[PDB]
Structure formats: C-alpha cells, structure tokens
Paper text:
The structure reveals a closed conformation in which the peptide-binding region of the ECD interacts with the extracellular regions of the TMD. The TMD in the full-length structure shares a similar conformation with the previous inactive TMD structure with a Cα root mean squared deviation (r.m.s.d.) of 0.6 Å; the most significant structural differences were observed in the extracellular regions. In particular, ECL1 and ECL3, which were disordered in the previous TMD structure, are now ordered and form a α-helical conformation reminiscent of the peptide-bound GLP-1R structures. The antibody epitope of the ECD does not overlap with the peptide-binding site, consistent with the non-competitive nature of the antibody in the cAMP assay. Remarkably, in our GLP-1R–Fab7F38 structure, since no peptide ligand is bound to the orthosteric pocket, the peptide-binding groove of the ECD is juxtaposed with the TMD interacting with ECL1 and ECL3. In the GLP-1R–Fab7F38 structure, the saddle-like ECD loop S116-E127 covers the ECL1 helical region Q211-S219 that partially occupies the orthosteric ECD-binding site.
Class B G protein-coupled receptors (GPCRs), whose endogenous ligands are peptide hormones, are key mediators of normal human physiology and serve as valuable drug targets for many diseases including diabetes, metabolic syndrome, osteoporosis, migraine, depression, and anxiety. They include an N-terminal 120–160 residue extracellular domain (ECD) and a C-terminal transmembrane domain (TMD), both of which are important for peptide hormone binding and activation.
Residue numbers in the entry:
A (entry chain B): 1 to 213
B (entry chain C): 1 to 226
C (entry chain A): 29 to 128, 135 to 257, 1001 to 1054, 262 to 421
The structure:
Amino acid sequence: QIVLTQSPAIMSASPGEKVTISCSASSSVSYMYWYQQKPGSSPKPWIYRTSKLASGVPVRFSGSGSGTSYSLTISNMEAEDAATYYCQQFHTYPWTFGGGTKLEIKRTVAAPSVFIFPPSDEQLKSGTASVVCLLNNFYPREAKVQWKVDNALQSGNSQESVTEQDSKDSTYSLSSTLTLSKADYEKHKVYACEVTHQGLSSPVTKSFNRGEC
Amino acid sequence: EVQLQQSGPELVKPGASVKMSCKAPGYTFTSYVTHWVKQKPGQGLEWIGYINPYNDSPKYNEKYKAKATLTSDKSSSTVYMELSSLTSEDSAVYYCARIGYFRYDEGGNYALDYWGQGTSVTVSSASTKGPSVFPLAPCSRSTSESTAALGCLVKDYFPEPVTVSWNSGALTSGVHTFPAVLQSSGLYSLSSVVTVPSSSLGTKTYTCNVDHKPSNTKVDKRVESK
Amino acid sequence: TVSLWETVQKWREYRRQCQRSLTEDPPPATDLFCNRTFDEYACWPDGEPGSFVNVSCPWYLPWASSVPQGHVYRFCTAEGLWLQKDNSSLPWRDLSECEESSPEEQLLFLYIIYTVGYALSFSALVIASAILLGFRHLHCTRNYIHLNLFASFILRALCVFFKDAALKWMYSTAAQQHQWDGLLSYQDSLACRLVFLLCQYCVAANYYWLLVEGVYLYTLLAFMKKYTCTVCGYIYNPEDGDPDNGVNPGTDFKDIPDDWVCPLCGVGKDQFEEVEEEQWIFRLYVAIGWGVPLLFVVPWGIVKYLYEDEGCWTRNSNMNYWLIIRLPILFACIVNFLIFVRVICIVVSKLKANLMCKTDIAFRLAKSTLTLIPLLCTHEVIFAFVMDEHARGTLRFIKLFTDLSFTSFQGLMVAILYCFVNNEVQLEFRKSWERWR
Ligand SMILES: CC1(C)CC([C@@H](Nc2ccc(-n3cnc(C(F)(F)F)c3)nc2)c2ccc(C(=O)NCCC(=O)O)cc2)C1
Ligand SMILES: *[C@@H]1O[C@H](CO)[C@@H](O)[C@H](O)[C@H]1NC(C)=O
Ligand SMILES: [Zn+2]
C-alpha cells in the first residue's frame, strides 16, 4: 500500500565526509525507522522514532524527518558505517520497508594487481576450460577486463564477479572467468586478458600460451 | 546478534509448498507476536505478516494472502510460515522478527529488535548438484614479481552456498572468495583466490577447503603451479 | 454507607460517559492504533502503539474515594493490539492499584437469597413432581399439566445451576482480583452461549404452561357433559347413567355419591378421568406449552446469531430484536389475565347459583391457578408496553435484574400451591403415614 522510496541506491563517501541518505514515503507517516544491515547478517534496528538512535549506534548518526521526507546522516564518517540501510514504516499495514542504500567508502585510487590462470588439466577432462583473470585490490570498482584469445576480442563468454569492499583496505577484487570448450580452447595459443583501470597508466595485459607451461 | 532460532535452508520445486520454523527461547510478556519479513535480492525487504501465538490468529500482508500461512505451536511456542504454489518470485531469505520496545512509557519507541537467522528458500526445478573444484595456479612464471596468486574454481553446484576456506582457515589474509555466479547452464560457480609470496610457491602448501552442505560435498584441493 | 443500588446507577452513568466519549471522540488519524473499548469496568481510549495507557479509576466504585487519581493500566503493542497475557481471556489490565465493602455485602446477600431461593424451589419442585409421579392415585389429566409446568421451572432452576457452575468453574483457576473479573468474561463468551438460550426457552415455557393451566381450568369449569376413567378407561355415559349399581339414567358425575367405584376395574370415584375429551386435548396442551415457546425462542436465537451474537447475545442496543420473546410472552400474559378475570366471573355465578361448591377440585385448583396467574404475569403486563414507549425501560431492565434475584422463589410457589397445597396429596400423605402405623 504505502511506499518508502530511499535515495541513492549505493552511496560512496570518503572518511570524514557528510553522508546523508534520504527516504521519501508515499503517504505522510508519523515516525521513521532505520535498520543497518551488514552483508552477512540479519538487519538491525539503527534509528527509531525518526531521530532516536538504537543502543550502540555512534552519535555521528542522526535521524531527521517529518511527513513523507526523512533522512539518515553521518558527520565524522568512518569505514565501520559501510552497509545497506533500510528505512521502515510502522504507521500502517502492510508495513513498508525501503529499498536500502548500500553505503561504500571512497579511498585512494589503487591499481589492480592482475593475474591470469589457465584452465586446469583436471578441467581439461570435464569437456570445458575456464580461464580466470584476477584483479586484486584496485579502487574504484569500475574496471575493464577484455579477453583476447589469439588477439580475438572475446565477448559474452566470460562472467566477472566483484567482491565487497574490503574490510581492511576498502579495495575491491574482481575475477573474469572465460568459460570455453575443450575444443575451442585447444584451437588457440595465446590467451590474454587486457585490464583497463583508473590506477593504470596503460591497460595491462597478462598473457599465457596454451599448454606451453 | 540473532535471537530467533529459525529453520534450515530449503530447496523446493516450483509449485510445491514450504513450511519453515521460528523457535523462540521464550516469548516476552511485552513482545510475543512474530513478524515474517522477505528479503529477495533486488526486491528489498518485505513484511509478509504476523502470527499472534496466544490466539493463533495471524495478520497478513494483502500481497501475501493465499500465499503464506502463519500458524503457531502451543507447546513449543514456535511460529510457522507455509508458502503454497511457489515460483521463482518466492526464492528469498525469510526472516522472523519480534518487536523490541525502547521506552514503554512513550508511544512509538520500538523496532524489530529480535531477529531470526533467516531461512533461505531456493525455488528451482534444478536438482541439488555437487561442486567440481579446480585449481587456479599460473604458468609457473613470475620472474620474481614478489607477489603470487593462486586459488580454487568451485564449479557447477546447486543450490547456493559454497563455503571456501584456505589452509583449513590458517590462511586468512590475501584471501578473496568471490560471490557465486549462476552460469548460463543453470549452476553456480565461484572462484576463491589468494595472494601469497612468490617465494612460497615451492615451499608452502596451499590446500583449499571447499564445503557444500546441500550435496554434502567436502573437498580439500591443494593448488600447485603445474 | 455506600448503596448497592446507587453504585449501579453511577455505573450506568459511567457507561453513559463511556459510550458518549468513545463515540463523540475523534479518531486518532494514526491509522494503526488499538481500538477504544469499555471493559465493563473501566473506560479505555485509543492507544498509541507502544505506550502504557494509564486511565483514571472508575468513580462508580465504592472505594474510589480511597484510591484517588487512579492507576489502572493496559498496554498497546507495536502491532496495534492490547497486550494479551492470556488470549482465551480478556487483555492484560492492571487493576492492582485500585482494590479494597457495603454494596458488595448487599450483592453477596442478594446472590445468597437467589441461589438458596433456587435450591429451595428446585428441591421442592423435584420432590413435588416425584409426589405426583410416584403415587399412582394421582396419574390423572389434571396433574399431568402440573408436572409439565414443574418441568419448565425445574429446567430453569438447573439452568441457573449450570451458569453458576461456569461462574465457579472459571473463578477456581487461581486467586486474583483482576482474574475474578476476567473469569466472568471468559465464561461470558462460551458457557453463556447455550445456557442463556435454554433459559429463555424455559421462561417462555413457564408463562405458556401457565396459559394451558388457566385454559384447563376454564375447560374444567365450562363443562350435556360426560366423564371417563384413568385406571381402566371406562366411559361413564351420564345420559345412560348406572342403575345396575344405583344411579338413575341422566345423572352427572357431580351428583354420583362419593361411595362409588368403577364397575370395570374397581377403583374409587376420586380417579375419574374428567371429560372423555381431556385425554386428547392434553396433546394440544403440550403443543401450546412447549410448541409455542419454540415458535418464538428459536427465531430469536437464530437472529441473535446471524446478526448480533457478541457478548452472549445480552447487548440489545443496536436494534430491539428482543420483541421476538417479549411480545409473545406479553400476549400470554394478557390472555392469562383475561382467563383469570373470566374464571372469577364464572365461579361467583356458579357458586351463587348453587351449581358448584368450594369442596370441588375445580374450586380448590381455581384458588391455586388464580394465585399464580396474577403474580407471575403482573410485571410483564404493566411495564411491557407502557415502559416500551421510551428509553426508560432501559433503567427498568436494571430493576428487572434485581427482581430476578428475588424471583428465584417463584419456582417453589408453583410447587407448593400445585402439590403441597393439594387436598389429594394430603390424603396420600395420610395414607402413607397410616401404612407405617
Ligand atoms: C398463599 C396464598 C396467596 C395462595 C392462597 C390461596 N389463594 C386463593 C384462595 C381463594 C381464592 N378465591 C376464593 N374465591 C374466589 C373467587 F372469588 F370465587 F374466585 C377466589 N383465590 C385464591 C390458596 C388456598 C388454597 C390453595 C390450594 O388448596 N391449592 C391446591 C389445589 C388442589 O387442591 O388441587 C391454593 C391457593 C393464599
Ligand atoms: C503509565 O504508567 C507507566 C508505569 O506502568 C509509566 O512508566 C508511564 O510514565 C505512564 N504513562 C503516562 C501517560 O504517564
Ligand atoms: Zn376404571
């Protein structure tokens, strides 16, 4: 029935910067409730009765709002505050939640340490062959992996997977898995992966030659 | 911080029904009504409904009427949520939560404080498959880069999840276990790589413990540079 | 002193204040809240979810002076409900701060004379009905009607004996002031359902078996007239008489000497079966005594279930559907008094015309029937329509509640006047006492 819309989708802030997450409801509600959910656990009461803080929540957090428009704000931002924040309404039935706002933490531009792995010869029995290209601990998240099997720009055969921002150094890690046939694989020699990133002056290409290792 | 002891994960065929448990150590005289919340990735968080255990009468979200069936046990004091005629739209984490009150004197100071672990539901026709694990070692060439990467490629399993530890949890740093990706085939696959010193590739052994409770798969793949 | 009546008159105004406010008061505009309701004790407003609703203690209470400001609580949950504790019972309330009297001293006394008045009556009626059924010398058309009038009162007396059992049933759960009040509610929803229905039928049967009692008394006086027998069933044709034993043809049973016995079986003349028509007309008397009460008690119970079955169908505020039981009982009362009036008209004429004597069974019964009809229907005629006109039959129904706690004896009254007072059972009393010595 009533709809809670909270902007932005994902928020990235450098430590000590003002974070301010909105939540505009469809119909005017009395109080607003916020939950901090950290990927890897159930949600947690974070702010109740619009501006009241839950026990253990640091004073940097402050809830504010009235009518439809509500927000959650952070002053002395810290990396500990990276998580998805759901606003909730207890005012009417059904009880509406928010879309959540994943909060991330800006940091120094880091370049990925790239690694390419051929497919196992154990896998070269399974009728397939998956070549992986790892990008370790770059910031920001946006990075380009470009597969080039014998200087042929591969497309729509690989699937990249990015971890969550690291707990300790706020970096990311990305893997691109070039899934290929045993026949398709054994037909080509030079397998390479061209990584384009903000931290990289020139796109790095980590290669390998088929079987020749 | 989980207080509500919920039931285990479930893999159900589309069209079937799933009934999950939410055992509470004991209902507080102030809070006894259990609420059920649906967390479907990308759908957000959804309040399904609640069950009053003292009168066994439940409240439902109009969206989830004739979908969910909330009941309670008298003896064990446990809530139950059945989900009839299931589809892909119903594959989600399912929480049971209870309201914790901050200041009973003042009106409105409360929140869903008591949360459950979350009963994940996977509505798929795909039968539970086992992960085939493969090493992720380079071409034995580094020319002294001083940093070397290697890992596991846990392939073709269903349903999620796969638990990847390294050197039986002794190796905790430089580790990266990527989120699973459902391959076009229909199965999940994930890589778990670890950056170690290039000097160790011929001195330190890197066993890679993979665990997949659904298919009861337990494997230790020691990764070597060919 | 504090009065046991004024404390209810103040309670009636507390419900007036309550009803007025919980209807005049604006909705909270919070959408999700917990409804404003009257506990039948305290008046509660709408509760803000997640707040302790503290209310001032009811002023109708006697000790209300000793506990000022008032601290009777209830909790509104985040869900929008009043805290339960026990759902098969009423919601949690804290009447702890408002407890301990003269009005309850009179209340217990009123209940004591009510239950002993009912135990006294039921025992007298059961032993009375055992007198007419035990002794064969009494198996006659007349007494059968009495036994049925006994039955309706006997069932009504064991009906109050079942309700009191549910009252003692729920109260024996433990020991608490709030629970005492709660035990009343849990029984006001379940046990009250079916018993109060049969009670309403019993009452309807009392008044309608009173009707046939008066009707049988009219037939016993309006009766060429013939007679029969109850033992063997010999029909004494008066137009034929019985000269073979010493009674010329054309003589009424009223003119046959007491020194007479039935020529077929040999039982006394005191065992005559009245007019040969009394036999089959009793089927009608049963059809009127039990049939008619069903014809308006089940219609009432049906609509008091299809339309308003909340609070043991006791709350009749929305619409006056109780006329389904009042009007037929009032109808019975008007004709019961019309019978009463016509009976006196006949007896006085019959006695003066020498055509009837006080020694007769028809006069002995008239003394009794003309005594029940006036007292049992008196209230149900004057108030019935006069009070119905306006909203003051409201405060008259509170008085009727008090009446009902004095009308417990009205069962014994039927037992005495129709059995203990009977000259026939007195001859059976003397026969039983002589059979020992
Ligand atoms: C305690 C009481 C108020 C009830 C008592 C008394 N009531 C009573 C007494 C007399 C007249 N009465 C006289 N003449 C007329 C007139 F005007 F002609 F109609 C009316 N009416 C009423 C009563 C006494 C005797 C019996 C009696 O034996 N029952 C048994 C019936 C039987 O044996 O089968 C019953 C009732 C006083
Ligand atoms: C109601 O009473 C409670 C104690 O049970 C108290 O904490 C609260 O302050 C009271 N609320 C009001 C309206 O004063
Ligand atoms: Zn005979």
